[PDB]
From a paper:
Bacillus megaterium encodes a functional sulfo-SFT pathway and the corresponding gene cluster contains a [name] family member, SqvB, with 51% sequence identity with E. rectale SftX. B. megaterium SqvB adopts an α/β fold with a central, characteristic β-barrel and belongs to the cupin superfamily (cupin from latin cupa, a barrel). Determination of the molecular weight of the predominant protein species in solution using size exclusion chromatography-multi angle laser light scattering (SEC-MALLS) revealed that SqvB exists as a homodimer in solution. The role of [name] family members in the sulfo-SFT pathway has not been determined.
We speculated that the E. rectale or B. megaterium [name] could play a role in anomerization of SQ or SF. Therefore, we soaked a crystal of SqvB with SF and could detect clear electron density for a ligand at the center of the cupin barrel. The metal (Fe) was modeled at the active center bound to the same amino acid residues as before, namely His150 (Nε2 at 2.0 Å), His99 (Nε2 at 2.1 Å), Glu103 at 2.0 Å, and Glu97 (1.9 Å). We observed that the water molecules bound at the metal center previously observed in the native structure were clearly displaced, the omit map (generated after modeling in the metal and solute) showing the additional, clear density of a ligand bound to the metal. However, we were unable to unambiguously model either SF or HEPES buffer (used in the crystal growth conditions) and the structure was deposited without modeling a sulfonate ligand. We therefore also examined whether SQ or SF could bind BmSqvD using nanoDSF but did not observe any change in melting temperature with 10 mM of either ligand.
Numbering used by the authors:
A (entry chain B), B (entry chain A): 3 to 223
The structure:
C-alpha cells in the first residue's frame, strides 16, 4: 500500500506514479494489456540474495504484444523484452539510455529517478532523487533523460519488473573506446551510461564511475 | 551574427546555444572532429526552393568520425549520417524520436525547440517554442524529449546541417498499425512522431497530425 510506504519514507520526496510530478520523468501507459508477458513472469521466482536482470528473453519477445509495442510504441525500431526481479531496497546506481525504457510492474515496486540534466561533471546528488510508487499492473515509459536503476521492493518477498528497450541495450561493450567527452567516462554497457554510488562495491569493482554524492538512499518497507 | 538575429526576433525567446537555457533541451558536443563530414558538405550548394533531408549517405557513414560517434556517443548502437540543407525560415512542425539526434551546424542556423512533456492531448502551443542560435561549427545533441524540426536560416543563401540518428530513423513506415495511444496518432515515420502546424498542407495531406496551436513562428534575417 502506498500510504504505508509513504509513511515509512519521509526522508525522500515520495509520490504515486500517477502524480503529475512524474510528467517530467516519464508517462504511464494505459492502453495495452500484457497477458503474454505476465504468463512468462509468473513462471519466475524472486531471488533473495541479489537482483537478477536478463536483458532479452526469447519467450517474451516471441509474442503478439512485442510486435505491437515494436511497430507502434517504438515506431518500428527493434526491441528486446527482459526482466529485473530481486530483493533490492537501495539506490545503488543511476543509469541512462539514449532510448525509451518501458517498465511493467508485475509486483508493487518503487523507482528512484533523477534527470540527466542534473548531472554536473559526472556527479549527481542523492538529494535530487525522487521516489515513485508503482502499483502491480502499471506500465511506464521512462524517458531517455530520466536517470533510473533497478527497482526497490515494496513487499518483503521482493519485486518483479518487465524491462523493454532497443535490442542490444545492456549488452557488453564490444570495443574499448578512446574516451574524450565527460559522458564517455560513464559509458558502461551498450546504450547504457552509469553513475554508481561509492559504497556500492559490486558496481565499483566492476569499473563503474563513482559519481553519486550523498547517502545511498534506502527505501524502507 | 547572433546580436543581429536576436534584435530582429524579439517576438520569440531567443538564445545562444551556449546559454544554460539549452541544458533542458540538449548538450553541446565539443571533443569531436567532423572534418571528413565538413569536406563532403563543401561539395554541396544550398537548395533555394525548399529543404532537402537525406537520412543516410554511405560516403558520410564510411568515415572515422562515424565509427567514433557509433561506439562512443551512441554506445555501440547502429547510426546513420545524413544532412538537412535549404532556405527554410518557419517552424512548420515539431517532431521527436525515442533517440538522440546530433545536428552539426555547417553554417550558422537557428533551431526552434520544445519539450515533449509540454504536449497535451496531441497539442503543442507555438508560445512554448524557444529559439537557439547555433554558430557554424557547433555540434549539439538533441534529447529524445526535445521537439525539433528542420533549421531556420541565418544567412540569405540558407543553411547546411549534418543529421545523425539511429539507423532507420525517418524511413517510411512498413506497417499500418492499429492505433491505440494518443502518441500513436503522431507516429509519422520510423522512430519519428510529428506534430504539424495546420498551415503546412503538404504534411497534413500525408497524414501528419495538425496539433500546433498558435502562429507558424518565423525567424527573420
Ligand atoms: Fe535501464
Ligand atoms: Fe529529427
Amino acid at each position: 500500500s502506498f500510504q504505508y510506504m509513504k509513511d515509512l519514507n519521509k526522508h525522500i520526496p515520495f509520490y504515486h506514479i500517477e502524480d503529475s510530478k512524474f510528467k517530467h520523468y516519464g508517462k504511464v501507459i494505459n492502453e495495452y494489456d500484457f497477458n503474454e508477458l505476465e504468463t512468462y513472469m509468473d513462471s519466475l521466482t524472486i531471488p533473495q540474495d541479489q537482483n537478477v536482470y536478463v536483458a532479452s528473453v526469447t519467450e517474451m519477445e516471441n509474442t503478439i504484444i512485442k510486435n505491437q509495442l515494436q511497430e507502434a510504441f517504438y515506431g518500428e525500431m527493434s526491441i528486446q523484452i527482459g526482466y529485473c526481479n530481486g530483493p533490492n531496497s537501495t539506490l545503488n546506481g543511476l543509469e541512462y539510455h539514449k532510448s525509451s525504457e518501458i517498465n511493467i510492474a508485475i509486483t508493487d515496486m518503487v523507482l528512484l529517478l533523477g534527470k540527466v540534466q542534473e548531472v554536473e561533471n559526472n556527479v549527481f546528488h542523492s538529494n535530487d532523487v525522487i521516489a515513485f510508487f508503482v502499483p502491480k499492473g502499471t506500465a511506464v515509459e521512462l524517458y531517455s533523460t530520466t536517470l533510473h536503476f533497478a527497482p526497490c521492493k515494496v513487499n518483503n518477498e521482493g519485486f518483479k519488473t518487465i524491462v523493454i528497450l532497443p535490442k542490444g541495450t545492456n549488452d557488453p561493450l564490444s570495443t574499448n573506446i578512446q574516451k574524450r567527452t565527460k559522458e564517455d567516462e560513464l559509458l558502461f554497457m551498450k546504450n547504457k551510461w552509469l553513475i554508481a554510488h561509492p559504497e556500492r562495491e559490486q558496481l565499483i569493482n566492476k569499473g563503474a564511475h563513482p559519481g553519486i554524492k550523498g547517502e545511498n538512499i534506502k527505501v524502507y518497507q
